[PDB]
Amino acid sequence: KSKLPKPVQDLIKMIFDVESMKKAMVEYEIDLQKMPLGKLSKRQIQAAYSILSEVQQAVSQGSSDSQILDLSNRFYTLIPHDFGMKKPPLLNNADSVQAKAEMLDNLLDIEVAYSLLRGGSDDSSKDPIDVNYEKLKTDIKVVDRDSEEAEIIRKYVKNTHATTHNAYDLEVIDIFKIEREGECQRYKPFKQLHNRRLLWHGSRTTNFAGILSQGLRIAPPEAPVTGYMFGKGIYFADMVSKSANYCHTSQGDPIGLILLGEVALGNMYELKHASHISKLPKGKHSVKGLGKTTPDPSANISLDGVDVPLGTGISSGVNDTSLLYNEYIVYDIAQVNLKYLLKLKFNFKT
């Protein structure tokens, strides 16, 4: 039987859960009869991305309908949604393209997870636990609840979580230290870059197999730009509250996963409103969206050079921003070093 610790074994079952994949798809109204899990394709998803981009263009130009109707019908022909009646919803605005793209993003990681869950040798010489674990290409270790690392992290979570949106309370059930294969050399260069911070990154549970196996990725060129406040990059927050909302947990499934990564920010280009760049000013190596709220700077803390902004949340200098929280973006995956993964229990106050 697996020599893996019990908490890791449970982590493995969580991310490679087929029922969870199926559930996310039905939550999207996708018809599994026509589009089963094993039938998801990458080229199919790229095609869908392209259509979405075309809708956004049609929307910006103000297409004289008809074109919007055909594009909409084309999208649903590729992504078989079952509605029954009322007819398929029309994709005629930014809000609509954003939702569909967010879905394609998730469906791609599910496709990635299903494709890994079915490879190599589906024999039993070894239990499914250790095999699937190996497929992640990531070394996973449990962090003792009573250590220095755990204390810092828990405080990070406890302090950057306030009451302004306290629709729930956070409880850390498990803390894992992580270092995926590949993310141990690639970073070494950007390490010779100042302003490295330990930041939060939340994401749907059904995307973690893809995230651990492939690392955080930047949206492909066929993907619509709408939905990314600061262009196609990798986003992080310094307040657990901001990231936790991307875990999409609920009273039904109050358990979610969240990452903590070391990101070599370098000189940050500061902005207060959405701006599509990806182009970056000379000398800048990241973007910091300025939020209304920020961790108490006096409470900052470090270690090895990586700053950890676990100060309680206070009002920042500028409020003339649309953003509520800080937001950090990098446009090179090499600037990111995934360090920890937290299994969190969301208790809703309701």
Per-residue three-class SS string for 285-316: CEEEECCCEEECHHHCECCCCCEECCCCEEEC
Per the CB < 8 A criterion, the answer to whether 75 and 100 are in contact is yes
214 near a copy of itself, judged by CB under 8 A: no
Q: Which residues of 306-329 are buried (b: 16+ CB within 10 A; e: fewer)?
A: bbbbbbebeebeeeeeebebbbbb
Per the CB < 8 A criterion, the answer to whether 224 and 75 are in contact is no
Query: Is 213 marked within a binding site?
Result: no
235 near ligand 78P, judged by CB under 6 A: yes
Query: Is 278 marked within a binding site?
Result: no
Query: Is 322 marked within a binding site?
Result: no
List the interface residues with ligand 78P, window 175-204 (CB under 6 A): 200-203
List the interface residues with a copy of itself, window 61-80 (CB under 8 A): 61-64
In the numeric block, which tokens belong to residue 236?
């992080």
Query: Is 62 marked within a binding site?
Result: no
Q: Which of 250, 303, 305, 332 is close enough to bind a copy of itself by CB under 8 A? A: 250
> Is-catalytic flag, 111?
no
- Residues 302-341, one symbol each (x = binds ligand 78P by CB under 6 A, - = not), give -------------------------x--------------
List the interface residues with ligand 78P, window 244-263 (CB under 6 A): 246
List the interface residues with a copy of itself, window 86-145 (CB under 8 A): 86, 93-95, 98, 128-129
**Which partner in ligand 78P, a copy of itself, none is near 235 (CB below 5 to 8 A by kind)?**
ligand 78P
271 near a copy of itself, judged by CB under 8 A: yes
Catalytic residues, by residue number, are 327
